[PDB]
Structure formats: structure tokens, C-alpha cells
Amino acid sequence: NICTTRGVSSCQQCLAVSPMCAWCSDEALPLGSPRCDLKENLLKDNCAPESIEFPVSEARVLEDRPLSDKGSGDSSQVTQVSPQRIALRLRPDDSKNFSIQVRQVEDYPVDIYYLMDLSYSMKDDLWSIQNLGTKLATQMRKLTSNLRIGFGAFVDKPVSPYMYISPPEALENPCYDMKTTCLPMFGYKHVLTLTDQVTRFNEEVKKQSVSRNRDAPEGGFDAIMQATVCDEKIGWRNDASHLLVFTTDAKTHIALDGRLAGIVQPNDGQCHVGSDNHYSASTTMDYPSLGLMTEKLSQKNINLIFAVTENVVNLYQNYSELIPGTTVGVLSMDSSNVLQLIVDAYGKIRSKVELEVRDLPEELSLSFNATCLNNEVIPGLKSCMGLKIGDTVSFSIEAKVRGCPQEKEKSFTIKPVGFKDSLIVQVTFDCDCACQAQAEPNSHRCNNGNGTFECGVCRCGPGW
Amino acid sequence: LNLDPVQLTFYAGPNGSQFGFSLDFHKDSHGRVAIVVGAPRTLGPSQEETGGVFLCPWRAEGGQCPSLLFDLRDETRNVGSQTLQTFKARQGLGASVVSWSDVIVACAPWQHWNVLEKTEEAEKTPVGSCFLAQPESGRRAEYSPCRGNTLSRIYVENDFSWDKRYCEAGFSSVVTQAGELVLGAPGGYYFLGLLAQAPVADIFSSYRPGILLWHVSSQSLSFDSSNPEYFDGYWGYSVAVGEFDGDLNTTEYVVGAPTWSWTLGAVEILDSYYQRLHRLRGEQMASYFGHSVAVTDVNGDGRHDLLVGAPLYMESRADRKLAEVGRVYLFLQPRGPHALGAPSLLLTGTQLYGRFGSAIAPLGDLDRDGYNDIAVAAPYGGPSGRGQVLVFLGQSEGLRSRPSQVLDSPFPTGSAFGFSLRGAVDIDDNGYPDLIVGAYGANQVAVYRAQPVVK
């Protein structure tokens, strides 16, 4: 006995004891029968079936669309999470369970913005990627039938000491003191908006050329920010995997480095690329921090790829660990193998399925058992790895409510990182009885108007 | 603890001058404490930003301050079949100020320099410069150790070795008790970073206007390095001095290299001959470990302890996620000749992007309990993101893990309240050390007076 030995006073206190307790609001109850007992014990004492107040934690679905087989076509009507919405009902200190399924859909649209270092140290690289637009799409065509590609370039903050400021001919031609000629220095410039026409990529590259600056590190992070927060300019599609390829052959400038140019204003995280397609806060706004870059990459759902030479691969491999979801590939010196590594990077990207929870109430706590590989259950795990495009996994989830909260209507979300779709859990906390809806305030039964009659017993009214 | 946050004093300067970017207390020959403030964007004669320095007298009501006048005209000297040039435009005069005895040292880290010889040149580059002044006597002097007369071609042949063309001397600065000025130059030796020392008395006695290139025999610069660990480390981003070798006749230098070893960041303790005694490595990459250093004895054992600020440290939080908040490290000096072990205390920020550790100021003994205390700035911290300065009190075991007092910014957003600090000086002569805080984003300086302890 636990429902009876607690000696509850009302129907509300009875259900709060344990999920297996019940309450009887019957008028014709025996003299000393405990109203708070098991549903089996109440019916054994001739309690009216209607008078039983026994909530049960259920979990029925509302939206259960089927997982799509092909992510191609349609007006972004693709489903990769199932179910999409379920109604959850719990009672105090109880717990109910439910499952979710995620699929790495085949033939999903992909955006690829190519962010190219064009400092003088990138001289040799430019020639190698002359026909990158076409030799690429051919390999990419085997994983997506809806590809778009764009191109942008960066050097460093066009301001001393990064920039050569003498003689006057060095501003128009930083290679003046040498025997050759190169472009004026520039922070970051947009070149090609994401497009399905690949020949626009090739012909835009063939008109690019390097510039020159003084210090080996380059302002590549200034260009990662803008290429992320300038949605409408770059042209990221709402329903497509976003790949931002960062190519460089040297170290990079970070936050607080700008102070060597008199720049102290922190990065504001906003877009500053106008109609001239040039970054206009380059000479007035400091470089971004890794935390600010992570915020916008996660906000705009961008997957950063560090395609760097092997002489700095260890550097960016260490940055990649401070920017979760970032991958690295080795640029074979002349960017000859950039082609293959992007495909290897895209597979690495779509080889993980990690769940994420948003707006979870303080009272609810979740537990997970993942089912990755072939029906291999992994307790206490909400992420899968080693997956291929087309694979499907599932997770077993249990919500354990602690007490009964004030608000009886809340709702949270379970979403895989990087995925568009999500599972919405509408929670409902049932710790009240239907007999409470029809109580007798100031009843004649309870102390002659000084009490309230509900669910059979006499409650002490408000004010006492 | 016992800093008065109700009745502050507000000094102010021209709009857009970044008044308060740097500050320090200043005692004249009579001990009258003042406040020297740097405004690295003050307009010059040609209505162009050149920076400036103000010398504010102490007035409980504050107000406007008079200028500490310096020469802001570009100079030219045709000598030795060469043409020397100085360009003070955008030089940033007042980007760092420091006071010693009755002398003020205000530096222009981005003053440019160029030497012309026929069709060749040495390239126009920011060697930096420091202007020295004795306000009472009116004496003036300069010190630009990274100026040279070597042409561009020579450096190319020598593989750019000992290239002092981008030093930016004066970026950081400190002065020893003996009177030896020490200038950080994070761009020296092709962005490896160098220090440059020289007695103040020898700077004054060897300076004459118009010379531009003169010798200071008693000076002493640090050394280049073929080590890639020091490449782009900005050695000299922040400097300080202290006693870390037991020998009281020697003065040890503390230097900050926030991008040392591929943005791992570090800070080294040296002797007056630049021989590394200890090195402290960053905990996280791009945390800018070494952005600000402070030296003071917090546990009252006579031995200076070290404090290092990593404003961009990203704390680890739930679900494998990182949050830029900043951090400060405390290194207590051990007894006798021994190495500084792991940090004795880690102070981590709270407010995202708050940059907790962007400045660290010894306060002296604020509450007069026998242990020296400190103040840590979070120029974009606090629940409003307007700024915040946290006071941590000293104790036998090091420092208190929690702040005794928090000073919220009286300025608006974007004032960078706390970007500069300075304490351990009793300005009102009430027996307690006081704190001055700069807010260059609002072009003001907030003086906090320390009152008797209430508890």
C-alpha cells in the first residue's frame, strides 16, 4: 500500500502520489473505504465505473508522413524525419516513450560556394582550377541532380601594414616593385552568385587574377562571415545542403589581429557587401572570432570545408575542432585534387546524424537508445556515425516528467543538426480530474458553506 | 569591494577622438596626482586624425581637460644623399600612455616612416614613435628605435632579416622603477615582435628636433628568430615588469605574444638581456592568451604574481558546445629559484562575447586587509552587454574565486567600458587606492573613488 498509506485529501493529491493511483468520486462509498487506491481495488468495493479518475500516459502521433525516397524534384516537399508531430500526455512523476526515424535522403540539392584565396602566394593554384566548374559537376552529378555553384575571392584588409602603400604606383599595382603586374588589393569580393550554369563558373574563374599583400596570414575569416550572413547575395537555397569551401595556402588572421592596422571595432556579424560586390567594413571592422563564426554558420546552416595545403593542414584541423561540423581536406599543393576532396567532404558531412533538442521544459528529461548500422541498439546515445547517403536510423525516446508543472500546455522540438525537418512534441500534463470541473463552491455539505465539495470530499475553500 | 559606484567622476573629450583609449595616473614634482589620457583619433592641424594626449587635473566633478601639446607636423630631412620622411597622419598618438616620475610617455604605434634615395625607397611603413614630455618644465623628446635608412632592395637580398620597418613601437609600453622605458613592438622583425628598451634620461639628452635619425647608445632591442613558432606571434602586444628571479638588482620583463605558435598564444618572462626565464603557453587556440598581462603580489608573500588575460577563450558547456566568454589565469611565484607551475586559479567570464580579460589592473590593497587586489574588465559583458569591471580580492591562497564588487557601465552601448584600466593610486588623498576606467567608445573616463569599508 502506498496510495492509501499516504492519506491524501483530494483527487489532485491522489494522482500526484504515483502513476498507478486512482480516485473514486462515488457518493455511495462505504464508511471507511480509502478513495485513493489501485483501479483494481476500487472496482472491488462497488465503485461506479464513471466515478473512477485514472489518467494514463499515452503518446499518439498526429503527423506521420512517410520518409521520401528521392530528395529530387517537388517544391521542397521532402520528408526526412518521421513522425513530424506527436501528442504526448503524462501524469505526475510518470514517463512515456516514443520513437523517431531519420533518413539521409538521396539526390538532395546542394549549394557549393567556392571561397578562394587570391593573395600572391596563391599564384600557381589559379591555373589548376581553370575548368573546375565542369570537371566537378560531372563527379557531383552522381550524388545530386540539382547542383548550384558560386565563387568568391579574398586577400586581406587593404590597409597598412598588410598593404603596400608606396610608391603611389604600388597601390594600383602591388607587384610594381617586381617585374610583373597584379590586381589592386582587396578584402573580399563576391564574383558569382550560386547558379546551376557551370560554364558561368569556368568563365568567371578564367578572368580572375591574384593580388599581393605584405604579411603571410590572410583575412580569410572576414570572407567566411560575409559569405554566410549575406544570404540573398550568395544565393543559399532554403532546402539544400550548404557547402562553403575555403581555400588557402597560409595561416589566417583572427579576432583582435586588426589592431595592428588601427582597427579595434569588433565584428558586428552583419552583412556589408553592397552592389559593388566588395566588403566595405574591411578597413574599419576587426576580424571575426571563432565563436561569432560558429553562430552564423549554425544559424544559416552552412557546412564549412577547409580545403588547405598540407603545410597548414594541422592548423586548420585544430580550428575545425573549435567549429563543430567543420571538415578538412588536403589541397595537393596546386589544388589539383580539390575535385575529389569536396566529394569526400560531402560524404563525410552526410555520414553523421546527431539529434538536437530545443525548448525542453525544466521538468522533462529525455533518454535515448540509438539504432545505427543494422538494428544495433546503443543505449544512452543520440547520434549515429559511419552512415551513407540513403541510410536510415531510428531512436527510442522516453520523457520523464518530474512533479506536475504550472503550465499544462508546452511543446518542444527534436531536430537533427543540419536537417530542415524536425519532430514536434506537444506535451500535455494531466494532473487534474474531470470532477474538478463541476465542483460546489460554498456547498451545503461542507461545514455549512465554509467549504467546497468536489470529487466526493469537502475541500477548504479559498481564504482559509 | 569598497569602490564607490554611486558618485563617480566623468572626464570627457572631443567626439570621435577615442578619448580614454589609454590612461595612467601622473604625479608632478609636488606629488599632485593627475590623470593622463590618450585620444588616438583627435584631429590635428589639417583636420585629419593624428591622435592627442590630455592631462586632466583631479576635480571631484571632472569635466574637460587641457591638451598636452606635441608636434603634429610631418618632417623631412635631406641628408646623406637620402631623404628622410615622417608621416603622422593616422599615427594614433595616445594609443598607449604611461607615466613615470614627472614625465609622460605617449606613443603613436602607427606613425609611418620612409627613406627615399633617387628612385629607390625603404617603403612607407609604420615604425611607430613615442613622444616624451615633462609638463612642468615644458621639455619634449621623441624615441623611434625602429627607424632605419636601409633601402627596400637590401632587405630582399638578406631574406628580410632584422626587418624593423613594421615595428609599431609604442603599441604597448611600461617603465621600470629605475627609469628604463620598454616599448612593445608586435610588428618588428616581420611580425615576429620585438621589445625596445632605453633610459628616459638618455632619450632626452640624445634627442634634437629635425634629426629624425639619431643614436641612443644605451638602448637595447630584442632579437630576430628563425623559429616558425614565433612567426606572426606579435611578441610585444602587451608588456609589464616585475621581480621573478630573486635578484633585486635585476628587472625582469613580461611580454605577451597572443598569436605565438600558430595562434596558441603565450607570454614569456625575461631578464633585461631578453634571455627567456619562463614561458607560459595558451590553453586554447585563438583565445588571444597574452592580450593583457599584469604583475602584482596578491597573496602577500613579497613575491610578484602574474596574471594573464585571454579575452576570447571559449568555455565548454553542455552538449559539446563552446561559448566565447574570456578567461584570466593566475600564476603564483614559488619560493626561491623555481618554475611557475600550472595556474593557481582560473577566472572564466559569463557574458557571451564579453571578452572577460581584455584588461587587468592591479588595484593595490583596496579593502586594506593586507592582500593586494585586482580589477578585470569585460568591455562587452554584463547582462546588457554595455561593459563591466569585476573586482577580485587577494588572499593567502591567491585570489578569491568570486568577485567582491561589480561596476556596471554608466555609459551607453559600444563605449568599450573597461578596455583600459589603472589603479593602485590614491588620487583624492583619502588613504584608499582608486580606480580609473576608460571608455573610448564614449570618449570619457570614469573615476571610481575607494571609500572606507562598510561591512
Binding site: N213, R214, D215, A216 | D159, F160
Partner: peptide, 4 residues
Amino acid sequence: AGDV
């Protein structure tokens, strides 16, 4: 060295 620089940008090379």
C-alpha cells in the same frame, strides 16, 4: 617571407 610574407605573401609567398
